[PDB]
UniProtKB/TrEMBL annotation, chains A, B, C:
<comment type="similarity">
    <text>Belongs to the PNP/MTAP phosphorylase family.</text>
</comment>
<comment type="function">
    <text>The purine nucleoside phosphorylases catalyze the phosphorolytic breakdown of the N-glycosidic bond in the beta-(deoxy)ribonucleoside molecules, with the formation of the corresponding free purine bases and pentose-1-phosphate.</text>
</comment>
<keyword id="KW-0808">Transferase</keyword>
<dbReference type="GO" id="GO:0004731">
    <property type="term" value="F:purine-nucleoside phosphorylase activity"/>
</dbReference>
<keyword id="KW-0328">Glycosyltransferase</keyword>
<dbReference type="GO" id="GO:0005737">
    <property type="term" value="C:cytoplasm"/>
</dbReference>
<feature type="binding site">
    <location>
        <position position="199"/>
    </location>
    <ligand>
        <name>cytosine</name>
    </ligand>
</feature>
<feature type="binding site">
    <location>
        <position position="199"/>
    </location>
    <ligand>
        <name>adenine</name>
    </ligand>
</feature>
<feature type="binding site">
    <location>
        <position position="199"/>
    </location>
    <ligand>
        <name>hypoxanthine</name>
    </ligand>
</feature>
<feature type="binding site">
    <location>
        <position position="255"/>
    </location>
    <ligand>
        <name>cytidine</name>
    </ligand>
</feature>
<feature type="domain" description="Nucleoside phosphorylase">
    <location>
        <begin position="24"/>
        <end position="269"/>
    </location>
</feature>
<protein>
    <recommendedName>
        <fullName>Purine nucleoside phosphorylase</fullName>
        <ecNumber>2.4.2.1</ecNumber>
    </recommendedName>
</protein>
<feature type="binding site">
    <location>
        <position position="241"/>
    </location>
    <ligand>
        <name>cytosine</name>
    </ligand>
</feature>
<dbReference type="Pfam" id="PF01048">
    <property type="entry name" value="PNP_UDP_1"/>
</dbReference>
<dbReference type="InterPro" id="IPR011268">
    <property type="entry name" value="Purine_phosphorylase"/>
</dbReference>
<dbReference type="GO" id="GO:0009116">
    <property type="term" value="P:nucleoside metabolic process"/>
</dbReference>
<feature type="binding site">
    <location>
        <position position="241"/>
    </location>
    <ligand>
        <name>adenine</name>
    </ligand>
</feature>
Amino acid sequence: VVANYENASMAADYIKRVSNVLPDIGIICGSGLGKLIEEIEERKVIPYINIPNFPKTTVAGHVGNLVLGSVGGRKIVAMQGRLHMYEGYSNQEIALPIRVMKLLGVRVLLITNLAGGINRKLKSGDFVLIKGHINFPGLGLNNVLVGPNQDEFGPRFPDLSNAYDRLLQQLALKIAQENDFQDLVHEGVYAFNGGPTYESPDESNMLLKLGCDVVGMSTVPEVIIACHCGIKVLAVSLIANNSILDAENDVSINHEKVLAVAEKRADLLQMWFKEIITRLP
Amino acid sequence: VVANYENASMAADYIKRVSNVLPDIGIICGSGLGKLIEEIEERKVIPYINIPNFPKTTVAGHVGNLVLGSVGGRKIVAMQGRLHMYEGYSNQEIALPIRVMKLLGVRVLLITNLAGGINRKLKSGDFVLIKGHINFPGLGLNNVLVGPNQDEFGPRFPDLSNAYDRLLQQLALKIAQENDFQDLVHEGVYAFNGGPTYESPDESNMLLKLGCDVVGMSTVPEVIIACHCGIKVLAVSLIANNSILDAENDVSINHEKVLAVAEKRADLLQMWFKEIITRLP
Amino acid sequence: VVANYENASMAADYIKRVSNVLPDIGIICGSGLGKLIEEIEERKVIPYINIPNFPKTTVAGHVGNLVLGSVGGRKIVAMQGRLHMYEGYSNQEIALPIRVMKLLGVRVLLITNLAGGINRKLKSGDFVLIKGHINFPGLGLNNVLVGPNQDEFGPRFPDLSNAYDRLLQQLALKIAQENDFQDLVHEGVYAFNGGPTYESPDESNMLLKLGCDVVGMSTVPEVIIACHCGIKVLAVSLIANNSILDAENDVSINHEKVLAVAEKRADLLQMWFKEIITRLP
Ligand SMILES: O=C(O)c1ccccc1C[S@](=O)c1ccccc1
Ligand SMILES: O=C(O)c1ccccc1C[S@](=O)c1ccccc1
Ligand SMILES: O=C(O)c1ccccc1C[S@](=O)c1ccccc1
């Protein structure tokens, strides 16, 4: 199924008929960071499997729902579940849910995910406001927009220089200062590693030379589809480890260590993003 | 359809039957830079759609013709239209037209395209003679030659150290000096960005660290197929903008700005390449 | 055919029924470096084409056999033939033979291949013990593990920090010292170039900036599949040329030059790996 105007319209029509919510804000919350979705008010839960043209996710399994409702008086739509390119999903499968958000009326997309630290000053448990990116799949002919252009959504050649909205970054930092956790919040450049192997010790060292602050396997595909169709983005990384220090000390990482960092910061991140939603223009 | 000896021969046989021209020189002219094709003498226009085994381009649409005739007393063949890998064309689709040129007798291929400037001394409207390249798709398992080797055309493992002919670069500069526009002409290393997003601000900064002078979304696939089968190449970039300066100043780019640079230089580039064709060995 | 538990079990069952050997050690020997396989004792030769679910290799042609027997009193299994990703084989095709080795009981995998030198101190004919890697296909969304995870074999997100076993590297160097050829043996970081074009002059210069010591078109896919399923690895490069010196001197390379280096070192490498097999834990 192509992520075109007709197919995206069929999905939006179904959703409107079931929901009655017209959202202005979309959220994609990474694994371990989804507690806010369980607190959406007056909510409506729509399994992907019932939405016309949504991608098939039964090989990977696990949860897959669209959730609509209110947070802080604002109308929102959340993607509950993982759609990452290391799983083998195509460009068209990643793009269709974001283009459905557009047709439902979304103007701002908020994204969080766990990631590895490269900048030597980043500690486990820190937050990074993403201000730019280095897209290794995109340089290497695996950009999420490779294929025919869908002209109804955006231009053939998009400019990404303002993909990460500056005022949303400033609002997120202001709320951190108000609640006295600004010492946990950094800004930086995100490297997209297609994955699913963690960055190797020698890949990490290369990334430090190249001016990368954080590295991860998510986020950039959704950022590019959003930017192509005029949706503003705020993207935040939660740092699981410092991969440069781990390379110098010969220290390993596992899945239990990463998800324990999510558990440590889940409630603060939930509070932070509730206030952001409440306050954004 | 595979870009093999049988399929390429069927296309060449059709072309010979219609044309009566045996060309020695091939040209691929980028968007906005094609006026020379409209001035080919005693010309014959063959739509791709009528040539056995030529790739299907109706999803992207727009023009798609092979044009044969004379320029400066030389016999040439031109590809009129865009075949770029960010559109989703396969390795086999890109390669077949170049291998047809080979079988028709082409010995020299000339290529022009718009591109982004990285070297700090490059200005909008400058020309760069390409002397080498950094192929990010090729390092990342999307080289145009991934697949079975077609042994009739070339070796399994090609050497690219002389892919950009030195004497053709010298002849192009000599003609610029004769016509007193040598101040617009530079040489440099081309980075292939698969695209279709322009290079991001932070990708541009990385490319400067890595010794790249220019970055673009074209040219390298055709260069590699030509080199594999023994065709000499001259490739020239027309600089649309300096992406390093634009990153430091927070300045954006759009499609209208890029094509306006093509309009500014189209007539000079046409004159330049007519003389090159006339004079090359 | 997917490289899953069921399909790999069907292949292992066939092999056990024919062979009677339960191997502890696997070997993959690169082109020109396979003489040791012709000296396996009490050996049994199984063409890939007769093994359920093994990949089809008839387009590339040439040899394709699994060989089981004894070396130095140890029970081994060898892959005789080339399975490289520049040929167009899929992730699933590369992975299935390694996962069959796992099910047959292999605990250690030894790998050799020809490669290009980047570090300025590397000479034609030198050996490099690989201690880490930079996986350009993996950063660019062509990692060998992209796709659904096969949970019976390993985790969704593998850690590669100990992919190249330290004690096996130490044992290989110790044997070199015993036989007084330690002056030929270096250690270093391997860059994976998907290929099949050799690294260009300007790509080589980039790789030197990025801390790469050697560059090649093999090895890393097998390393990653082995690490995912708990197999220890020793990987050795035979240096064909120094690509940095060749770029500074404008010197080319061809297939006959590369294979002549293999001929020069084949007998010493055979002796070296026989002793390693005899002595490893
Ligand atoms: O995305 C995840 O859920 C995830 C969970 C556990 C492990 C890995 C990932 C993929 S990630 O963006 C990430 C997390 C940690 C380090 C590097 C990259
Ligand atoms: O190729 C084109 O026709 C083109 C036209 C308008 C915009 C972009 C392109 C693709 S390019 O090689 C290029 C042009 C400008 C900057 C970077 C890359
Ligand atoms: O792998 C081979 O058999 C091979 C044989 C002749 C040429 C090239 C290769 C692929 S390689 O890992 C390699 C060899 C030499 C330089 C760079 C890379």
